[PDB]
Design a protein around this motif. Structure first.
Motif, PDB file in Angstrom:
ATOM      1  N   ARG A   2      10.306  -4.375  31.630  1.00 12.98           N
ATOM      2  CA  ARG A   2       8.973  -4.265  32.265  1.00 12.98           C
ATOM      3  C   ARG A   2       8.918  -3.141  33.371  1.00 12.98           C
ATOM      4  O   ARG A   2       7.906  -2.303  33.357  1.00 12.98           O
ATOM      5  CB  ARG A   2       8.530  -5.738  32.868  1.00 12.98           C
ATOM      6  CG  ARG A   2       9.231  -6.133  33.878  1.00 12.98           C
ATOM      7  CD  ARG A   2       8.836  -7.361  34.515  1.00 12.98           C
ATOM      8  NE  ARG A   2       7.382  -7.158  35.004  1.00 12.98           N
ATOM      9  CZ  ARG A   2       6.586  -8.269  35.524  1.00 12.98           C
ATOM     10  NH1 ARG A   2       7.362  -9.501  35.721  1.00 12.98           N
ATOM     11  NH2 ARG A   2       5.669  -8.070  35.943  1.00 12.98           N
ATOM     12  N   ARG A   3       9.994  -3.158  34.200  1.00 15.03           N
ATOM     13  CA  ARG A   3       9.949  -2.107  35.386  1.00 15.03           C
ATOM     14  C   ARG A   3      11.025  -1.229  34.938  1.00 15.03           C
ATOM     15  O   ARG A   3      10.682   0.287  34.944  1.00 15.03           O
ATOM     16  CB  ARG A   3      10.503  -2.926  36.507  1.00 15.03           C
ATOM     17  CG  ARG A   3       9.002  -3.781  36.938  1.00 15.03           C
ATOM     18  CD  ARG A   3       9.748  -4.327  38.385  1.00 15.03           C
ATOM     19  NE  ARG A   3       9.763  -3.790  39.345  1.00 15.03           N
ATOM     20  CZ  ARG A   3       8.733  -2.728  39.658  1.00 15.03           C
ATOM     21  NH1 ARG A   3       7.425  -2.915  39.297  1.00 15.03           N
ATOM     22  NH2 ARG A   3       8.769  -2.010  40.821  1.00 15.03           N
ATOM     23  N   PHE A   4      12.158  -1.637  34.775  1.00 12.57           N
ATOM     24  CA  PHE A   4      13.290  -0.528  34.403  1.00 12.57           C
ATOM     25  C   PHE A   4      14.626  -1.317  33.726  1.00 12.57           C
ATOM     26  O   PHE A   4      14.938  -2.550  34.544  1.00 12.57           O
ATOM     27  CB  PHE A   4      13.502   0.351  35.537  1.00 12.57           C
ATOM     28  CG  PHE A   4      14.002  -0.425  36.988  1.00 12.57           C
ATOM     29  CD1 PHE A   4      15.561  -0.881  37.026  1.00 12.57           C
ATOM     30  CD2 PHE A   4      13.051  -0.687  37.725  1.00 12.57           C
ATOM     31  CE1 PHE A   4      15.675  -1.498  38.071  1.00 12.57           C
ATOM     32  CE2 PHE A   4      13.680  -1.437  39.001  1.00 12.57           C
ATOM     33  CZ  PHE A   4      14.808  -1.755  39.024  1.00 12.57           C
ATOM     34  N   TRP A   8      18.889   3.655  31.768  1.00 12.72           N
ATOM     35  CA  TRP A   8      18.025   4.436  31.694  1.00 12.72           C
ATOM     36  C   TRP A   8      18.787   5.910  32.179  1.00 12.72           C
ATOM     37  O   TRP A   8      19.704   6.343  32.039  1.00 12.72           O
ATOM     38  CB  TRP A   8      16.875   4.311  32.592  1.00 12.72           C
ATOM     39  CG  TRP A   8      17.109   3.440  33.859  1.00 12.72           C
ATOM     40  CD1 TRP A   8      17.149   1.958  33.872  1.00 12.72           C
ATOM     41  CD2 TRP A   8      17.426   3.853  35.187  1.00 12.72           C
ATOM     42  NE1 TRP A   8      17.417   1.682  35.110  1.00 12.72           N
ATOM     43  CE2 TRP A   8      17.637   2.746  35.984  1.00 12.72           C
ATOM     44  CE3 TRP A   8      17.633   5.142  35.666  1.00 12.72           C
ATOM     45  CZ2 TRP A   8      17.931   3.052  37.214  1.00 12.72           C
ATOM     46  CZ3 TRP A   8      17.816   5.315  36.896  1.00 12.72           C
ATOM     47  CH2 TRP A   8      17.827   4.490  37.863  1.00 12.72           C
ATOM     48  N   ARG A  12      13.689   7.088  30.861  1.00 17.27           N
ATOM     49  CA  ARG A  12      12.781   6.564  32.030  1.00 17.27           C
ATOM     50  C   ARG A  12      12.665   7.450  32.990  1.00 17.27           C
ATOM     51  O   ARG A  12      11.367   7.744  33.558  1.00 17.27           O
ATOM     52  CB  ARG A  12      13.692   5.336  32.391  1.00 17.27           C
ATOM     53  CG  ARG A  12      13.471   4.894  34.029  1.00 17.27           C
ATOM     54  CD  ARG A  12      13.579   3.469  34.258  1.00 17.27           C
ATOM     55  NE  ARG A  12      12.835   2.688  33.500  1.00 17.27           N
ATOM     56  CZ  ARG A  12      11.516   2.667  33.375  1.00 17.27           C
ATOM     57  NH1 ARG A  12      10.679   3.269  34.160  1.00 17.27           N
ATOM     58  NH2 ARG A  12      10.978   1.520  32.343  1.00 17.27           N
TER      59      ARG A  12
END
Length: 13
Positions: A2-4, A8, A12
């Protein structure tokens, strides 16, 4: 996800 995730720093960032 959802956030990270963690793997990544490719798409990202």
């Amino acid at each position: 996800v959802r956030r990270f995730p963690w793997w990544w720093a490719f798409l990202r960032r």
